[PDB]
Ligand binder design. Structure first.
Ligand code: ATP
Ligand code: ATP
Ligand code: MG
Ligand code: MG
Lengths: 97, 233, 198, 246, 49, 148, 84, 49, 212, 49
């Protein structure tokens, strides 16, 4: 028969837009950014099933802003908890912008 | 002499067939595209089956060739094997070596890999007759077969309270669809076997640990920024 | 330069002989222990070596090796007679299950002669010997002579191994499957082989 | 019961990684990043630490996955940096003994792209000390200093109960790894090393491996001695007599 | 059996280490009188082989 | 000058496709679907219709890429069903002429898994004719048949 | 090759241009963007394949699903569109 | 070769190895002058041999 | 060191076998073709690696031989791995006549181009016509049908000599052809002014020629 | 090598007092003439001339 069609959802693009707008301030003020605190504060704004995607996208946006000078110290970072049910994150603080 | 050798060979063959049959069951109902199962097909070569039967029951017809002290046992085995299937040729190699070949049980077995594809029955696994994902999945299946066999082999040389580690890789994992990845995760989990997979972000498996990589230039030198996530689910 | 393993392979003492044989069209089965092992070990390079001649080195699914020339073959080609394929398909039929109990792998010329006469149609038999022939003793004697001749040709191809004595009794090798029919899921070999022979 | 586990992977002074440690998952670890980020580099590190044999090690590109040897370059040299480099694994046995195994890597100077490799193993390390700390000195500069094997041996020997073993041949290294349950089979000889590497690299690139398929019985069936040694002993009297006659 | 349990088992079974397992031991009773060619002390055990 | 373009690709009686027509795009056309769906098969049909030289065609897996193997089987036969098969391309020339190239494929009965190819070309076909309908006959209640 | 045949060809014909790429999933977003701009600047047609829809906002896309059905196989094709 | 290399993607071993043959076109004006010298050089070969 | 060509084969021999000319040449050589000076490519190739080829073929129990006239050919031994065959007496008659034609300065002005009729005329001028006719048919007595039959047999044998590389037909005309130096092998029984019997014995001992 | 072959004795003998070009070198390329190390075969490559 004749060909049917199906459409995509843009929810994740919208999510990326909110996160990038919310995060732009850190660069502009060159404020030190800690992934642990930011993830813990930002996951509280969405329900549990969506946390994983939010974490991924937030990390994608955050890593573009500068580097963490501690990485050259030879000292590994710890696994910080960011919500209940037991999710963890590992990252040094971002200092060099 | 004679019958007892046949019995030890038969029991060794039987034990190998049974162990393979046990390994075989763990791979039932694995979904990889249109492939739905994998097997290791084990069979006995005819030219050796008849030899084994003759050595079992017609020994009085050939005892001259066995008790002749001018030649050794392995030579006797080689000469009997040439007496049967006379069309076989020998490549100017010592009969001693052919005898020792007949003494090794593995030479009696024929081995194949088969897959239960789609509407069809069991087919021999040929790379050219499969899609990409089906080929990758079948490869993983055979690899876990090998690992299980090797662990069973060595345990008689290891401490009673030691269980070796098991780990395998997969590069360019984006080539597999979600259903195939679910199947692969189920297999490795049931086999207590660790996995490390690389994908250019196209796949986001919820279970396990994830590492985000970004390469940059810093003080005129290449540097990799790394972030990690885990615990979801 | 030349790949190291290819140089090793063709440096082996067994190569000249096998080369000679293969160029002739002989088929290497599992019977020839050393030759078969040699091919198994060095297939990846021998295939490339013979591709330079526009000739293909094929391993049949049953296990035997043989060469197939292309249209642009560098090796002079030659072609079998109709009676040759008739006999070949007969031998493929004789590679049966009751064969094991009937002959224990060793046949005689008479088995094949009588099978050929019984199973084929008279018209193609006359076409084989000569169209002017009609059911005469001399024609049957000539057909026997031709059967022995083509059987020796096939022995050259390696299809059939004569038992080492002057009498004409032989055994059939697995490579005879090359004459065989196409196999489809669940089809009985006897029926399909007969269907082609008809 | 309680199968052992790989716990972590550490890179020091590799191309793009001055000092990095990955904490491996109990079931699945996923590496993710754009093209050229360095994923395959990490797997190269893992396997080279596992099988430190320069005759087998060949990191061909994923495209052209199945071709011949081709070039004389094995693709490893370019992943190192000037100076001293390390790759180490951290393992926990069923006994819960912490063992650290690894190799030291260095670019051999010359026209050609060659590498020098030396295995080593450490046992009894406290749970409080990480590999990166062992292998680097926190000098006043912005970036630490990677310390060679001499400094490392001196630093480790000072510890109480810690043993540092440095191997001269790959065979010894594999023997120790097997005894501690890090690998499923003890690599008697070079042929065993080749088959083990075949397994690993076939898993790495993926697909129905040609070599595994050819020699299926050689891989899946153990070799049994019982059928043989009886007849070697019975045959002995004749063998000696024949040799004496010759 | 592994090397760790080997000494234990060898001590446990003692002289009977090299006996034969035979699940009935009454089927041998008729055969037994014929045993003139055997080790001076033969051990038999009953159980599932 | 206006460069020529490929309008569409048509498959008849392939493995999994009875009669399907893909309409190509001016710049990029993407095929998606789980493993074994039939994407590589579509690629193979296109290239076969472009270069019918049976000596060259050799469809290896994506794995084992670049290995000169001389495999026993070129991998084309299995992608065809019994009976007659087609593969055709519709092209708009720079002269704005519609031309339909293609090949008729057919399995060869016999132990060897061989294939037969016969190229053909059509010019001047009216713009209203679709290849899918041109290559089939409507027999029965919407149960069309393919025609040699 | 197109430049070489400028002499033989008639003045008014420019030959068609088309290439393939299987397992496009091996490329990341930036790489595919580069590839698309290259091919469009050269009036080059492309046909690419991937298990997942890697190009949602450019060109046309088809989705293939295989169904086992009455002891044979049948492929169902449906189109996809950038926005809904 | 061109289409197959595109299909499987990547640096095709065969293409790069013979890049001259694939990229550089042939010229008939060069041949027309070289015909005479070809005759001459053939003759010289003859003599040499 | 290990995995090094020299372990198994001389470099020059491997270099020769890897050449693009080898398969053609090999195929031809095995088929009995003689190689002269005119086919430069082949000849030059032969010259460059002579000893390697000789050594190679030796494996087969066959001699790669170089005649004084500069032409190469294959001579199998009694233990040969490759079959050996002999030419027919009519082939010899045409061979010795082609040899005399090559030498003849009287016809050198033709620049090597000869016609089947000229060959036939020379042959009948020298040999016993009516006695030679016995080979065409046992009843021949000079009839024209039999004379045409003889001419057709000559036409056929000459075509066989072309496959052996002893004569080359013109590109567009098949009634005319050119000779090559390979024909001098037909003079092997007389190139030395000695006792014919001893020469013949020497030749059969060397494997060059058989009686009938 | 093109300069060597192009420029001839009588006029360019005054040019030939340079260390890089001489007549004999054309025959020296006879060594290169016999066999260059070509690898893949199509159409017909043969020699330096
Ligand atoms: N031997 C080498 N010599 C030089 N550069 C190299 C070498 N190996 C890798 N590189 C470079 O190192 C960087 C990382 O390469 P690598 O193969 O690890 O990438 P990747 O993240 O695995 O990429 P992808 O998954 O797309 O294959 C790339 O720039 C690559 O060019
Ligand atoms: N020669 C063949 N013989 C039999 N079945 C085949 C053959 N070639 C392909 N198939 C089957 O046809 C189906 C389609 O395969 P194909 O490779 O076209 O799929 P795909 O969607 O491109 O998959 P992938 O992305 O994993 O490569 C699969 O089931 C494959 O097993
Ligand atoms: Mg990579
Ligand atoms: Mg596919």
């Amino acid at each position: 028969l004749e060909l049917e069609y199906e459409e995509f959802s843009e929810i994740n693009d919208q999510l990326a837009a909110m996160i990038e707008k919310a995060l732009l301030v850190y660069q502009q003020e060159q404020r030190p950014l800690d992934l642990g605190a930011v993830l813990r504060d930002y996951l509280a704004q969405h329900p549990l099933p969506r946390h994983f995607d939010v974490a991924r996208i937030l990390v994608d946006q955050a890593v573009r802003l500068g580097v963490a000078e501690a990485d050259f110290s030879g000292l590994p970072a710890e696994w910080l908890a960011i919500n209940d049910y037991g999710a963890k994150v590992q990252a040094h603080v971002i200092d060099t912008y | 002499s004679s019958k007892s050798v046949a019995n030890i060979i038969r029991k060794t063959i039987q034990r190998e067939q049974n162990r393979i049959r046990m390994l075989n069951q763990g791979l039932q109902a694995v979904s990889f595209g249109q492939v739905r199962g994998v097997r290791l097909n084990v069979n006995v070569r005819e030219s050796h089956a008849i030899l084994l039967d003759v050595l079992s029951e017609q020994q009085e017809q050939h005892q001259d060739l066995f008790n002749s002290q001018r030649l050794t046992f392995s030579e006797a085995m080689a000469k009997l094997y040439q007496r049967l299937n006379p069309q076989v040729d020998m490549g100017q190699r010592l009969p001693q070596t052919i005898g020792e070949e007949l003494l090794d049980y593995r030479n009696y077995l024929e081995l194949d890999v088969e897959v239960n594809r789609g509407s069809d029955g069991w087919l021999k696994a040929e790379s050219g007759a499969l899609s990409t994902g089906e080929a990758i999945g079948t490869g993983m299946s055979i690899l876990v077969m090998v690992v299980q066999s090797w662990e069973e082999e060595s345990r008689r040389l290891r401490g009673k309270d030691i269980s070796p580690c098991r780990l395998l890789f997969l590069d360019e994992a984006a080539r597999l669809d979600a259903k195939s990845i679910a199947t692969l995760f189920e297999l490795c989990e049931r086999l207590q076997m660790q996995l490390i997979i690389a994908a250019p972000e196209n796949i986001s498996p919820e279970k396990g640990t994830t590492y985000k990589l970004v390469r940059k230039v810093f003080k005129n030198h290449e540097h990799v920024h790394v972030v990690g996530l885990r615990g979801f689910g | 330069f030349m790949p190291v393993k290819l140089a090793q392979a063709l440096a082996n003492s067994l190569f000249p002989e096998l080369d000679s044989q293969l160029r002739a069209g002989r088929h290497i089965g599992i019977d020839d222990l050393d030759n078969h092992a040699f091919l198994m070990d060095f297939q990846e390079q021998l295939e490339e070596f013979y591709a330079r001649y526009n000739v293909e080195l094929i391993r049949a699914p049953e296990g035997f090796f043989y060469l197939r020339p292309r249209s642009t073959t560098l090796i002079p080609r030659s072609v079998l007679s109709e009676l040759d394929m008739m006999v070949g398909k007969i031998l493929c039929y004789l590679y049966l299950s009751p064969e094991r109990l009937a002959n224990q792998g060793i046949f005689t010329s008479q088995e094949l002669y009588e099978e050929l006469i019984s199973l084929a149609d008279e018209g193609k038999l006359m076409k084989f010997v000569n169209q002017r022939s009609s059911g005469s003793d001399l024609d049957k004697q000539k057909l026997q002579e031709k059967v022995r001749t083509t059987l020796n040709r096939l022995r050259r191809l390696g299809m059939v191994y004569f038992l080492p004595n002057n009498n004409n009794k032989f055994t059939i090798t697995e490579a005879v499957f090359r004459f065989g029919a196409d196999v489809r899921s669940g089809d009985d070999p006897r029926e399909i082989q007969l269907r082609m022979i008809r | 019961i309680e199968r052992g586990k790989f716990r972590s992977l550490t890179l020091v002074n590799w191309n793009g990684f001055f000092a990095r440690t990955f904490d491996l998952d109990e079931l699945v670890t996923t590496l993710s990043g754009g093209n050229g980020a360095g994923k395959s580099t990490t797997m190269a590190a893992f396997v080279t630490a596992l099988i430190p044999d320069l005759t087998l090690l060949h990191f061909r590109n994923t495209t052209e996955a199945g071709a011949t040897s081709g070039s004389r370059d094995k693709g490893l040299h370019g992943k190192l940096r000037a100076g001293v480099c390390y790759s180490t694994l951290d393992v926990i046995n069923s006994r819960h003994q912490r063992v650290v195994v690894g190799v030291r890597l260095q670019q051999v100077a010359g026209r050609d792209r060659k590498v020098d490799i030396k295995p080593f193993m450490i046992q009894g390390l406290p749970t409080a000390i990480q590999p990166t700390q062992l292998l680097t000195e926190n000098v006043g500069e912005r970036q630490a200093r990677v310390l060679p094997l001499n400094e490392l041996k001196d630093r480790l020997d000072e510890m109480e109960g810690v043993q540092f073993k440095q191997f001269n041949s790959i065979t010894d290294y594999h023997a120790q790894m097997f005894d501690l349950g890090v690998i499923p089979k003890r690599l008697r000889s070079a042929s065993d090393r080749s088959k083990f590497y075949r397994l690993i690299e076939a898993s790495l690139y993926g697909g129905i491996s040609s070599a595994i398929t050819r020699s299926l019985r050689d891989y899946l069936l153990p070799e049994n001695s019982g059928v043989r040694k009886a007849f070697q002993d019975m045959e002995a009297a004749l063998r000696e007599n024949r040799i004496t006659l010759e | 059996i592994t090397i760790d349990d080997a000494p234990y088992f060898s001590a446990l079974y003692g002289p009977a280490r090299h006996g034969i397992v035979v699940p009935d031991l009454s089927l041998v009773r008729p055969h037994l009188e014929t045993l003139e060619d055997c080790p001076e002390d033969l051990y038999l055990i009953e159980g599932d082989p």
